[PDB]
């Protein structure tokens, strides 16, 4: 029963500044086989369907702006938004795919 804790629950910043958020897993999501971290980040704008931003911890999905950067491994992962845009107002979920799938609590980003 894997548990992913995201921190903080919510945060607010101005457009143009840098933010980081944490995704800690109760179990290692690293597979020695292919040497991959089975963690992914999802962006969910208000009232809209979730979108895949990053997979394998650090791999950016096609079309995703470079200002989004995923990092970390094992049990500690981080999502960094370098120069937040208004479009970025959304809830960001980390999700383990190491065994089946499990979503984190999510981190809600506000843009004031």
């Amino acid at each position: 029963d894997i548990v992913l804790t995201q921190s903080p629950s919510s945060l607010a910043v101005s457009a143009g500044e840098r933010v980081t958020m944490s995704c800690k897993s109760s179990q290692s999501l690293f597979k020695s086989r292919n040497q991959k971290n089975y963690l992914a980040w999802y962006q969910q704008k208000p009232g809209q369907s979730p979108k895949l931003l990053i997979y394998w911890a650090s791999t950016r999905e096609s079309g995703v702006p470079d200002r989004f950067t995923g990092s970390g491994s094992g049990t500690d992962f981080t999502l960094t938004i370098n120069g937040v845009q208004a479009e970025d107002l959304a809830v960001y979920y980390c999700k383990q795919s190491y065994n089946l799938r499990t979503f984190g609590g999510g981190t809600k980003l506000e843009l004031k």
Binding site: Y42, S49, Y55, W56, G106
Partner: protein, 119 residues
Amino acid sequence: EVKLVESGGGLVQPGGSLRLSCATSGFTFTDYYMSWVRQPPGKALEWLGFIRNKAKGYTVEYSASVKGRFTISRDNSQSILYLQMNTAEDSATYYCARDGYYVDAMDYWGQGTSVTVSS
């Protein structure tokens, strides 16, 4: 252009059953897994389960929360995914999403369908 479209949601009452549908296109349906993820109003995303692709044998997996009550089917000739819900907490928006062991993530999502519960 990839497409996922959910439908078959509305008002029901606990113990009852509801059939959810997810019409797909824009990709080789049988090559990918297919997951169902729900989201209670103002709450987190929850993975319900998926059904593997061709090479894997179309076998299914479930979350302990819905395992048993829910069942997942797919139509390899029409490319439509199904969520057969059986039997207050299940209320939510229901998304079907393309999954698989390629990126190990859901790289494509539908627009969801609302499921409420009122006596």
